[PDB]
Amino acid sequence: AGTINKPKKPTSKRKTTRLRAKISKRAAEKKRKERKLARKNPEWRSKLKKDPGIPNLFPYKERLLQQIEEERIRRKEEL
Amino acid sequence: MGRLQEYQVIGRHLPTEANPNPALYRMRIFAPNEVVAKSRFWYFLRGLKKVKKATGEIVSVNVISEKHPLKVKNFGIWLRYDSRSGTHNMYKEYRETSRVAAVEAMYADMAARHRARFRSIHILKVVELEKTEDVKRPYIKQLVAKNLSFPLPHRVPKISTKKIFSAKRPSTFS
Amino acid sequence: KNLGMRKNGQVWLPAKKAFRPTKGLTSWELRVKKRQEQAAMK
Amino acid sequence: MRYIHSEETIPVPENVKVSIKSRLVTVEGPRGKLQKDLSHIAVNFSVVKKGVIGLEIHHGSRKDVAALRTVRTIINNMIIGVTKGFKYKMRYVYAHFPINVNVEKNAETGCYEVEIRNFIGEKIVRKVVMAPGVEVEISKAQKDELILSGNSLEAVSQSAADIQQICKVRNKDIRKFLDGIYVSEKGNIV
Amino acid sequence: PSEAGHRLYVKGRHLSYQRGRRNTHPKTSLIKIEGVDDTAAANFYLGKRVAYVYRAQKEVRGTKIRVIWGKITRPHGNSGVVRAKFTHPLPARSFGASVRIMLYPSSI
Amino acid sequence: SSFESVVVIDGKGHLLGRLASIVAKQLLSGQKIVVVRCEALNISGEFFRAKLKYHAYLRKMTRYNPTRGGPFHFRAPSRIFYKAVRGMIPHKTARGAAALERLKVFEGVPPPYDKKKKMVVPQALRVLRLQPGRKYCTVGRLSHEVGWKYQDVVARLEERRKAKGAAYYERKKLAARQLSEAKKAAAAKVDPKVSEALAAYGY
Amino acid sequence: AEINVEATSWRRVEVGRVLKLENGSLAAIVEIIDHKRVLADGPSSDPKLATPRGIVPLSRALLTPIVIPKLPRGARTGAVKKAWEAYGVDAKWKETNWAKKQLQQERRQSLTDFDRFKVMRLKKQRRFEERKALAKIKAAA
Amino acid sequence: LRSLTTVWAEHLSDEVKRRFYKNWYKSKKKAFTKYAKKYAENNGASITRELERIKKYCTVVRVLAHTQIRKTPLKQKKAHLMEIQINGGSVADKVEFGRSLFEKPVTIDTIFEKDEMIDVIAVTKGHGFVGVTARWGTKKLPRKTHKGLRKVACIGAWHPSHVQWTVARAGQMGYHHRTSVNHKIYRIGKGDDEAN
Amino acid sequence: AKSARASRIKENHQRFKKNIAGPVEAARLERLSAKLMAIAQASGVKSGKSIGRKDSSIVFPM
RNA sequence: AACGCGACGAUACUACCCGCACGUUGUAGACGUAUAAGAAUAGGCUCCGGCCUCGUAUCCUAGCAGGCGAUUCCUCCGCCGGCCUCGAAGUGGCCGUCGGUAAUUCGCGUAUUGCAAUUUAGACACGCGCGGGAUCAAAUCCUUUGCAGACGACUUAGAUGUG
RNA sequence: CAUCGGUUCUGGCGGGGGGAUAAAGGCCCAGGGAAUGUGGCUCCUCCGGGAGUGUUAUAGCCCUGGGUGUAAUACCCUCGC
């Protein structure tokens, strides 16, 4: 495009008070609306979220798993 | 997230007639002061063991100082951070002289690279890498290289901002 | 002289190497040992 | 990620003299001299070995590290130009109107001038002025061939592209009208 | 003969009144002392008397030159600017004019 | 920080806005400023960005009459720097007009500023401010591309000025050589007590 | 093959390199933490040149031309002091032009009013001798 | 461009001295009388020094020439004086050329030649104050249009709340400066020829 | 139609100027210059050979 | 550009220029109001030995606001004149005369402004004066013109003539 | 100008207490270990330096325990001048 030699009308980054108030009002209304939809939401949700786990690049993951086995065997023996 | 210290915070549930000797829970908290350390402690036990502040007490708060603050160390930090997608695991490495310095650099790094605030970051593990072969990231592997040496090209000289005018043009070679 | 043909016809171009800016940080033997540890932990 | 150190090496033949000062590379050989100002790229030049030129970038990004490959290839092309030279062979083909190509050497400027006439029967005379240091010869071994030779690969290939682009068939079906001048071979003089 | 000068004062410039973004207060002036670039250097000049010397039209009591006297009260900001209080506020036209900071009252 | 009669500033190698800020602050503090070689000032970024901004500036004009009230577009580099300075000073006030009367801007170095000390401002120097690899342009190149007519005249005048400066520098090097020889010769005939007294005092 | 290269030869941050800090003290580099920070130690007997062991930002330091040879990486204060006294870092630092400039600065800063008057008079006498020498030299050619 | 110096000839005609006056009939006609004496004092040292200043410092050299208006049938006696640029050669060549041409008449056929295309510069015929119909060529309004029909119906039906500079208005017509190019010379006739 | 500012029209005009109108204008200039040249030919301080000084400000008043 | 600039011609007076004689004359603001390399910044400077973070430098800097007289020194400064030189908005270099001058040392004076009160001190511009040197001009109204024109404005002419 | 009173801004100095009776660290004593392996040895070389071996030698480092030691210093609190 010939933008450099012949630029067009600039787009103003200067806001207006009416537009700011309207945007704030519509944002608050959308927040209330999504709160209502979250209250009336029919979607199934798990009681416990799926935990991501231990990263593979962590160097001490294997010794941490060794520990985790040690506390599970210790708890099984204590119980 | 500021000048932090590592605190050992031990707390418990208040003793009752049924349970006269309740169990004690210890955590390591990176916090600017003791009030924030105890608040974060009660936050984490509210999230984990369903123990509240009103029904519990703090048994001990101690400062964990670094054993060798004058030794350069490599630190691996396993963390989880919350974004608009959800919770993500990250493993990162920091070459520092103390655990608190590593955690401060971690907080600044996540703020710079992912816009994650203090409230959305959970520090799950901070470890010192015992061996050089334990280093995973290239930006620490280049620093632990044998016979490391480099120059400093294009150094801007320190000139006082109150000295407005100079009679000679500065050089960037030393 | 060169024995092969270059596809774009610029026969003066040298035999380029792979762009590996992180080359030389780790060794092959250490990477093999880390492969073994990684497979066992997985 | 910023890499602490990155290194490139350029081998230099024995009959070549290379002088680098303030990133201005001057390469001298049997066929003459070439000169290139490379001060737009942050690079440290050194003599790492007898006959090897070393290129260093310190604390550079991936883009800054990758620019060293371009610098390496440019200097190697300068060396190849002053040792073996560069040669582009172009062929002009026609269907009905023979393309008349005249090659002269201008006296006051020292550059070659190529005049093209009767391109698809046109009465205009196309004239292309070569870059300095580029010699153009009408070939005698083969039919309807020009040979552009020199030390600068940039100059030789740009002159070849200028000759190719001045003879464009316009507003005609290019599947049917095959007339033009095209680069046929690229290589070294020696 | 002597080729030296006779200056026993430090040069300063009258920058502005004490002000916010919009409201100004003429009762306090801001002075830039020459060679003073920090609060530690400005602390030397606290309490030093400062004169604004100007010229009038009429000759009154043998002189055309009038003086307004004041003192340096406290440092201002971090860059060595000081606050000064005069008997009358300095003229608004003198923003950018020169003032003389004396070496008295001396505590050396 | 020191007060001077006038500060002559070499405009070569300086970033336009930062130099304008420092010069405007000095003018409002009461310091006289002369800027020379405004055609060698720098703007950070690509040249086409400065070119686009100047063309967007050139778009603006009073619709009903372009001879009054409109943005009058000055194409010379000294006037571009002057506009940058003026936009940073309350120029519709008497104090701002007084601060603007303490400034002079020129293309090249007209006499007698060619035999005066030209200062630099490190807070606006491009080699000290811009990151390596970042792009920059020239105000003189921008001016020539938007309609300044005197780039070649200024270039020839600067060539003659630099030849005369080279001759003066040869004389200066000769004078420095004789001054060093004179100090070495007078080192013998100076009283030794005076010598270690000055050495212990630090000169 | 004739190769002539004129480029920039910076000083290198490395183990054994001595840094001058902003307060005039010295410190040998023991560990390179990153490209912006190092670990340093100044075990000098002179209190002005001494530096406690700690992290030194490279933006706040300058590279001196003194490198302690074969200084081990990670060496503690005793071994660094032994290498420092064996290499004689203080004497070479005193012989450098930076310390002479600093000494001149302190001598000029320590002058009193009587000292400045005596300096002016002695400089006028030396200037008279230098002016006679310069007149003799310029008269020759 | 900046005029550095001007060098005049020793003797100037009365018809060109009339150019420097408004009331020549009342005047003492003292123009250039003190200037004529520097051709005599010091063997013209000031004139020569100004000539060398032009030779060594200047890039553009123009002669000053005036018409011989007395040979025309005009009642005007004050002649017209203009700067004519010397092109070609070096600056010293131009200066020696002008020095050689001082106090000399130059005929039209040594500057222009038959079959040459030239440009003509003049002020046009004056018309005084003229309405839009003849000043700009606007369409006339219909017959018996109220408040005039040799006018423009709308001078600004749209925003801005101003009359724009591009709208046609009644005003001065003619007496404009014009440069018209590419005019062919068909004959340069000589006044001494009785059959030109 | 190709405009008067078109590049090809400019190149055509430049070739016409260089090859056709140029020699004619040069010969006319030689003749006219010869005629007008025929008409034209028909101490340093005290002599004026050394150029001494003739018999708003750029600086601030000081 | 009617508040941008240059060259040139003639300039009557109270006009112009030179000297000193000062301002109840003014000026966004004197007080050592001292200081010319160019160029690069992933490189430069040089006396060719070396040197470069750094103007925290260099020059200047003492005497009644700076006297008088010596001892002593040939150093520094200023006005004029000659020869060169300097055009981006024009000025420096050398030489010569004259005048001043602690680099060293000493003698006589400083008081009383009374315990501080701008240290009235500089430059430019303007003005009033003398004593001299230099120079004797234009414009407008008016009459006229029609290449012009609502009116002003514009092109012309009006002093002896090609009126 | 001096000596005071009220309010307040700012600079420095002398003490006390706490914590892992700071953590470090220096100098010693006793163990243990490794490499970004010092010296030595072997093999390559562009003779510049690489590769391998192995635990202090012709450098050093890391971990634990103990002494000096109620050490110093930081940080926090506090008594004054």
3-state secondary structure chain D: CCEEEEEEEEECCCCCEEEEECCEEEEEECCEEEEEECCCCCCEEEEEECCEEEEEEEEECHHHHHHHHHHHHHHHHHHHHHHCCEEEEEEEECCCCCCEEEEEECCCCCCEEEEEECHHHCCCCEEEECCCCCEEEECCCCCCEEEEEECCHHHHHHHHHHHHHHCCCCCCCCCCCCCEEEEEEEECCC
Residue type, H189: G
Residue type, I29: L
Task: Considering only CA atoms, give the Rg of chain I.
Answer: 25
Which candidate from I40, I48, I52 shows the least CB-CB separation from H100?
I40
Closest CA to F129 of F55, F196, F42: F42
| Residue F6 to residue B61: CA distance in whole angstroms | 65
F66–H163 C-beta distance less than 8 A: no
Q: Give Cα H193 distance to the centre of its chain.
A: 29
Asked if D12 contacts D52 with a C-beta cutoff of 8 angstroms, the reply is yes
| Residue B164 to residue F122: CA distance in whole angstroms | 7
| Residue C25 to residue B144: CA distance in whole angstroms | 9
F104–I60 C-beta distance less than 8 A: yes
If one counts every other C-beta atom within 10 angstroms of the C-beta of residue H85, the result is 9
Which is it for strands B150-151 and G12-13: parallel, antiparallel or unpaired? antiparallel
Q: Which nucleotide is nearest to F110 (CA to C1')?
A: J88
Strand partners, F43: F137
Rounded to a whole number of angstroms, the distance from the CA of C16 to the nearest CA of chain D is 9
Q: How far is CA D153 from CA B130, C7, D25, D76, G44, in A?
A: 55, 18, 16, 11, 61
Task: Look at the alpha carbons of B48, B52, B56, B61 in this order and tell me if their dihedral is positive or negative.
Answer: positive
Asked if A55 contacts A61 with a C-beta cutoff of 8 angstroms, the reply is yes
Asked if G100 contacts G22 with a C-beta cutoff of 8 angstroms, the reply is no
Q: Give, in Å, how far the C1' of K52 lies from the CA of B146.
A: 17
Return phi, psi of residue F182, to 5°.
-65, -40
If one counts every other C-beta atom within 10 angstroms of the C-beta of residue F102, the result is 19
Taking contacts as CB-CB distances below 8 angstroms, the residues of chain H near F63 are 160, 162, 164
Closest CA to D156 of D86, D106, D73, D102: D86
Asked if E49 contacts E73 with a C-beta cutoff of 8 angstroms, the reply is no
| Residue H55 to residue H93: CA distance in whole angstroms | 9
| Residue B18 to residue B16: CA distance in whole angstroms | 5
| Residue C9 to residue D89: CA distance in whole angstroms | 13
| Residue D148 to residue D133: CA distance in whole angstroms | 10
Q: Give, in Å, how far the C1' of J127 lies from the CA of E65.
A: 21
Closest CA to E73 of E84, E65, E63, E81: E84
HSE-up (13 A, CA, CB side) for residue H138 = 20
Tokens of D72: 């390496």
Taking contacts as CB-CB distances below 8 angstroms, the residues of chain I near H43 are 47
Tokens of F77: 């580099």
Name the protein residue, with chain letter, whose CA is nearest the C1' of K73.
Answer: G52
Taking contacts as CB-CB distances below 8 angstroms, the residues of chain B near G19 are none
First to last CA, chain D: 44
| Residue H34 to residue H40: CA distance in whole angstroms | 11
Residue type, C22: T
Rounded to a whole number of angstroms, the distance from the CA of F50 to the nearest CA of chain I is 27
DSSP I19: I
Closest CA to H20 of H58, H66, H57, H70: H66
Asked if D88 contacts D156 with a C-beta cutoff of 8 angstroms, the reply is yes
How big is the C-D interface in CB pairs under 8 Å? Answer: 21
E9 at interface of F, judged by CB pairs closer than 8 A: no
Asked if B87 contacts B116 with a C-beta cutoff of 8 angstroms, the reply is no
Residue type, D142: Q
Closest CA to D45 of D13, D15, D12, D77: D12
Task: Tell me the three state secondary structure of residue H122.
Answer: strand
| Residue B101 to residue B119: CA distance in whole angstroms | 19
How big is the B-F interface in CB pairs under 8 Å? Answer: 35
Task: Tell me the three state secondary structure of residue H138.
Answer: coil
The structure tokens 């065997």 sit at A73
- For D77-100, letters b (16+ CB in 10 Å) and e give bbbbbbbbbbbbbbbbebeeeebe
Asked if F35 contacts F63 with a C-beta cutoff of 8 angstroms, the reply is no
Q: Which of B160, B162, B165 to mutate to test the interface with E (most CBs of E within 10 A)?
A: B162
Tokens of E34: 């020459």
Asked if G88 contacts G39 with a C-beta cutoff of 8 angstroms, the reply is no
Q: B36-39: long-range contacts (C-beta < 8 A, 24 or more apart)?
A: B37/B7, B37/B9, B37/B61, B38/B9, B38/B11
F140 burial type by CB count under 10 A (0-12 exposed, 13-18 middle, 19+ buried): buried
DSSP G44: -
Q: Which nucleotide is nearest to B73 (CA to C1')?
A: K62
Closest CA to H87 of E23, I33, A63, B24: I33
Q: Give Cα H188 distance to the centre of its chain.
A: 21
DSSP I18: I
Asked if B159 contacts B166 with a C-beta cutoff of 8 angstroms, the reply is yes
HSE-up (13 A, CA, CB side) for residue G77 = 12
C38–A56 C-beta distance less than 8 A: yes
The structure tokens 């030209």 sit at F118
3-state secondary structure B114-139: HCCCCCCEEEEEEEECCCHHHCCCHH
G48 burial type by CB count under 10 A (0-12 exposed, 13-18 middle, 19+ buried): exposed
Rounded to a whole number of angstroms, the distance from the CA of F91 to the nearest CA of chain H is 28
| Residue I32 to residue H61: CA distance in whole angstroms | 19
Q: How far is CA I5 from CA F115, H9, H119, I12, I22, in A?
A: 47, 46, 22, 12, 21
Q: Give Cα D33 distance to the centre of its chain.
A: 14
H/E Cβ contact: 3+ pairs below 8 Å: no
3-state secondary structure chain B: CCCCEEEEEEEEECCCCCCCCCCEEEEEEEECCHHHHHHHHHHHHHHHCCCCCCCEEEEEEEEECCCCCCCCEEEEEEEEEECCCCEEEEEEEEEECCHHHHHHHHHHHHHHHHCCCCCCEEEEEEEECCCHHHCCCHHHHCCCCCCCCEECCCCCCCCCCCCCCECCCCCCCC
User: C-alpha angle with apex G95: G91 to G96, nearest 5 degrees?
Assistant: 120
Give the chains touching D; criterion: ≥3 Cβ pairs < 8 Å.
B, C, F, G
Chain K nucleotides close to protein (CB under 7 A) are 1-2, 9-11, 19-20, 22-27, 35-37, 46-48, 50, 59-64
| Residue D12 to residue D18: CA distance in whole angstroms | 8
Taking contacts as CB-CB distances below 8 angstroms, the residues of chain F near H167 are none
Q: What is the DSSP string of A24-76?
A: HHHHHHHHHHHHHHHHT------SS-------TT-TTHHHHHHHHHHHHHHHH
| Residue F119 to residue D83: CA distance in whole angstroms | 49
- CA torsion, ordered B157, B163, B167, B170, to nearest 10 deg: 10
Name, in order, each residue with C-beta under 8 angstroms of B80's C-beta and a sequence gap of 6 or more: A52, B87, B88, B89, B90, B121, B122, B124
| Residue B138 to residue B140: CA distance in whole angstroms | 5
If one counts every other C-beta atom within 10 angstroms of the C-beta of residue F160, the result is 9
Give the chains touching F; criterion: ≥3 Cβ pairs < 8 Å.
A, B, D, E, G, H, I
Asked if F45 contacts F137 with a C-beta cutoff of 8 angstroms, the reply is yes
| Residue G27 to residue G68: CA distance in whole angstroms | 11
Return phi, psi of residue H177, to 5°.
-80, 130
Asked if B7 contacts B64 with a C-beta cutoff of 8 angstroms, the reply is yes
| Residue F124 to residue F41: CA distance in whole angstroms | 10
